């Protein structure tokens, strides 16, 4: 109960830090000064950028973890609250992206963490129980529309909205 | 003129086998330039940085394969067939994918034109192979998702956080998800 205390500071203050400056505002002394650890208490914790902010990202979408008739209508209900989310915050997105752009297999886990999540959401939004092998793979396949278009994004080649609209034609050209 | 297009090919030429020989770091514009027997300005003008390069030399090749007999019976098939090709080569060359790959990720809007077009003649080849001839709307949507699975999972490759293997796995899964028969 003070690890736990430990990270919630560590990944509030990556959350904030990102929130406000972006990827480039995200630097370990920044975080670790904003969060009152040590900074070697940091980087045994996390030992990079990538890793804070998969993290962060991922306890986001644990948070969220905790609507329609047809698989469809869930689905894009889940892709809905997402999209807003990503466009409602345009700066985390960008320290987001960044982020899964630079992460190697150094943070293997912390990104398989986020997967398992993320996939599962929308499994578990497709599915009337315990999800299939296929509801599985549909989610990874949306979670890589959603990355690539993000990846152009980025790059500034594509807007927001041409990201939601690709994910939208995503899951009907799967599930529609 | 004739000559230009000669030029082009033999710098779209030195930066594909620069590129499948040594990968992203190799392709370095005098480097280019050199074995193409250009000059650096002239190629700088044509194309104006690794990304125009590599991105144009891609797009030549889908070019090629779509100019250059049994066929799949289904679309799924045809495109199964396609795709299983287009993997074979690239698992046949890592250092190729290493600096397409690379110049897919770090492709900014200064080359957000050429990426297009070639984004363009990607698709068209998958739909066309889809349909056996013009091709629905819904099957250039389905020749862009399978692109965007691609890419996703050749940035996991890049990363060591995925093996070429699981790249081909998804892109299997990800057409029999979309058109599956």
Do not use: C
Request: net charge positive.
């Amino acid at each position: 109960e003070a690890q736990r205390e430990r990270r919630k500071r560590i990944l509030d203050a990556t959350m904030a830090i990102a929130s406000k400056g972006g990827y480039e505002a995200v630097q370990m002394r920044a975080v670790a000064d904003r969060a009152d650890v040590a900074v070697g208490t940091l980087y045994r914790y996390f030992p990079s950028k990538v890793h804070l902010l998969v993290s962060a990202l991922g306890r986001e979408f644990s948070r969220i973890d905790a609507a329609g008739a047809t698989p469809f209508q869930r689905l894009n209900f889940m892709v809905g609250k997402l999209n807003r989310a990503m466009q409602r915050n345009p700066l985390l997105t960008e320290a987001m992206t960044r982020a899964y752009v630079f992460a190697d297999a150094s943070a293997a886990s912390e990104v398989d963490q986020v997967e398992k999540l993320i996939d599962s959401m929308f499994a578990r939004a497709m599915a009337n129980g315990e999800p299939t092998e296929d509801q599985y793979h549909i989610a990874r396949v949306i979670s890589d529309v959603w990355l690539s278009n993000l990846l152009a994004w980025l790059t500034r080649r594509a807007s927001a909205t041409d990201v939601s609209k690709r994910l939208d034609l995503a899951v009907r050209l799967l599930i529609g």
